[PDB]
Amino acid sequence: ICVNENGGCEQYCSDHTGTKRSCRCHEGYSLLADGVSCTPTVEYPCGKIPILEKR
């Protein structure tokens, strides 16, 4: 599943035994209840530009 369109994950994807897939996030992010989206948990998450985010 992870090979195709990142398994629908916003960030990381792990394939599991069968048709199971688990999305994961980089440190400073947490996974939303949709099981695909990553939301920042810290003030300065990696790979986000604050001057652009604060617009």
């Binding site: 916003e10 990381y12 980089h26 990696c46 530009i49």
Partner: protein
């Protein structure tokens, strides 16, 4: 950087400037508060290992605006497979002596997981390359941080689209081509070690390191970048390791 534009202040907040004895050496990428990724070749000629400085939050080299943060480089980690004066395994992992403080102007770039990088990021066509390198081949270096959008090529396509010049190094599985063959846009030697950053679903990730080429923005030639996805496990294991006496460390690769 040739044929790009000034990166608006704070829009490349992971960019690092490396200095030796106060002189411009190379670029780098901040990946957390204490670790910087650069190019191994940047350290081929260092003798004064104790005068190596990393500057974060830098934009304009002519003025101090208070957003800059300087840190001594405590450790330079290079793969055992890298040979000085050559091209393969062109990566260095730098430990800062004290962490940088994250601010609107100093933010790390995401170091991605290998699977995500190979399966997804490797297929994002355009990415950004940045630095205070040459604005023209045989020209002056930039006083303001520059950025350029470059398309990535499959290696077979890079070899086919390039001018068949003698004594030219091979493009290995530890590299990738990106840029243009028409001589208009490229990163330069002064940008060495700097980020090749890829945007995916609202977040930026480290995919390449400004590594080498055959003259800046030379017709028939693309820029060559270290393929960061090959080094994820090597980098992660080293970031969990204790510091060792002495600045330079050669670490086994894989």
């Amino acid at each position: 950087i040739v044929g790009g534009k000034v990166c608006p202040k704070g829009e490349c907040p992971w960019q690092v400037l490396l200095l030796v004895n106060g002189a411009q050496l190379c670029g780098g990428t901040l990946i957390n508060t204490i670790w910087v990724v650069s190019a191994a070749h940047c350290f081929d000629k260092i003798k004064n290992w104790r005068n190596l400085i990393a500057v974060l939050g830098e934009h304009d080299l002519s003025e101090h605006d208070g957003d800059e943060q300087s840190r001594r480089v405590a450790q330079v980690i290079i793969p055992s497979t890298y040979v000085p004066g050559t091209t393969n395994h062109d990566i260095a992992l730098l430990r800062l002596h004290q962490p940088v403080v994250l601010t609107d102007h100093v933010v790390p770039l995401c170091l991605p997981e290998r699977t995500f990088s190979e399966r997804t990021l490797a297929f994002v066509r355009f990415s950004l390359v940045s630095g205070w390198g040459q604005l023209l081949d045989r020209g002056a270096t930039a006083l303001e941080l520059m950025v350029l959008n470059v398309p990535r090529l499959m290696t077979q396509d890079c070899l086919q689209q390039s001018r068949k010049v003698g004594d030219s190094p091979n493009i290995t599985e530890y590299m990738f081509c990106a840029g243009y063959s028409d001589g208009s846009k490229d990163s330069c030697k002064g940008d060495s070690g700097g980020p090749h950053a890829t945007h995916y679903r609202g977040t930026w990730y480290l995919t390449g390191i400004v590594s080498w080429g055959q003259g800046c923005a030379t017709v028939g030639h693309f820029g060559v970048y270290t393929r960061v996805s090959q080094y994820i496990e090597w980098l992660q294991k080293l970031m969990r390791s204790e510091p060792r006496p002495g600045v330079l460390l050669r670490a086994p690769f894989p």
